[PDB]
Amino acid sequence: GXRLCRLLSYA
Amino acid sequence: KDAEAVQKFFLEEIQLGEELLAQGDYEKGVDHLTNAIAVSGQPQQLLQVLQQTLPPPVFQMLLTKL
């Protein structure tokens, strides 16, 4: 995992 | 600093949220996402992105727990 982290940081 | 602490908390809460959702523990996962959303200066933008990514019943549950 870890994808959700990047989508949300970039938000 | 306050910023490294907050980035860490935000990221770790998301990671636990994702892991929980992957295991089907939707309610618990959503609880952790609401912590990540609560420390963000743009909650509405995080919510839009989650709407585009999460299954509709999990997103909806998210909305009720905020």
Side-chain angles (χ1 to χ4, degrees), chain A:
Chain A
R3 325 194 201 70
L4 206 69
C5 308
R6 339 199 178 92
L7 306 175
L8 286 51
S9 321
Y10 297 150

Side-chain angles (χ1 to χ4, degrees), chain B residues 15-33:
Chain B
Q15 170 192 297
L16 318 163
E18 191 179 54
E19 312 187 325
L20 290 150
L21 303 174
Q23 295 164 14
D25 292 311
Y26 294 133
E27 212 177 33
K28 182 167 217 310
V30 153
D31 287 342
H32 287 286
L33 296 178

Side-chain angles (χ1 to χ4, degrees), chain B residues 2-14:
Chain B
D2 294 313
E4 210 137 65
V6 175
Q7 170 160 75
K8 179 165 194 288
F9 177 66
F10 175 78
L11 302 171
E12 294 207 296
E13 288 297 298
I14 296 158

Side-chain angles (χ1 to χ4, degrees), chain B residues 27-61:
Chain B
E27 212 177 33
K28 182 167 217 310
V30 153
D31 287 342
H32 287 286
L33 296 178
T34 66
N35 291 334
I37 296 163
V39 301
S40 159
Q42 30 202 8
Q44 307 167 334
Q45 280 277 303
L46 268 61
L47 284 168
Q48 292 170 349
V49 168
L50 291 152
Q51 188 161 41
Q52 310 316 304
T53 78
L54 297 180
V58 171
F59 184 66
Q60 183 106 317
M61 181 180 6

